């Protein structure tokens, strides 16, 4: 089902794309996995810990 | 852990890749060939070394 | 020197003795005010002490003999 969805949005069914480097502008040799992961900012703010 | 995977990926080899069996005059033009995109990072080659 | 003190250790032969000698010399150069034997090169007195010990310019016997020479000369200046 994940891959039927990836095909619905015209994305690589492998879920893993060709990324170019930002600094030197040359492609990363072998495909990289890219997608939206949900991140949480925890309560360990370095402002309070330093 | 990341440095060791970098070293392992760079000092490895393949059956038939860009620059398969050419001779290089040393390590410096090995680096030049890799950067130019004319030879793959791991492709069997004869290099003169001192 | 700045990054590794191996040469000083081979010149004295003991990590701990090297620390003691270098601290004595750095105290001489920081409070005693006497001039370094190697160029400053914008270093803290500790590192000049280590660099001097690297060149064999400062050994515990050398520090002893310089101190004794100056003290005996002051005692001569007493009379």
């Amino acid at each position: 089902e994940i891959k039927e969805l990836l095909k619905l949005g015209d994305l690589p069914t492998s879920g893993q794309i060709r990324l170019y480097d930002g600094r030197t502008g040359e492609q990363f040799e072998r495909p990289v996995t890219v997608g939206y992961m949900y991140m949480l900012k925890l309560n360990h703010l370095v402002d309070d810990k330093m | 852990q990341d440095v060791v995977l970098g070293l392992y990926y760079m000092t490895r080899d393949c059956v038939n890749a860009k620059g398969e069996g050419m001779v290089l005059t040393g390590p410096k033009e090995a680096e030049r060939l890799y950067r130019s995109g004319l030879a793959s990072l791991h492709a069997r080659v004869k290099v003169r070394i001192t | 020197a700045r990054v590794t003190v191996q040469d000083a250790v081979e010149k004295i032969g003991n990590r701990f003795d090297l620390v003691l000698v270098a601290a004595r010399r750095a105290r001489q150069m920081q409070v005693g005010g006497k001039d370094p034997l190697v160029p400053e090169e914008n270093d803290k007195t500790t590192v000049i002490a280590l660099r001097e010990i690297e060149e064999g310019l400062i050994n515990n016997q050398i520090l002893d003999v310089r101190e004794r020479q100056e003290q005996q000369e002051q005692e001569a200046a007493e009379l």
Partner: protein, 51 residues
């Protein structure tokens, strides 16, 4: 007040001044090692990966 001369004095006083980094639990003597500081703009200490 944090004048801009304080920062110059700080970079002058911190040169060649080793600082001991510790992490607890200190299980062995290589758990407290003297580094040599580099002043950075932030609030997190920066550690060399190899150590």
């Amino acid at each position: 007040r944090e004048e801009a001369v304080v920062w110059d004095i700080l970079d002058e006083v911190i040169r060649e001044h080793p600082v001991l980094l510790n992490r607890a639990p200190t299980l062995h003597r290589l758990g407290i090692q003297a580094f040599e500081p580099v002043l950075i703009e932030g609030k997190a200490i920066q550690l060399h990966p190899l150590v």
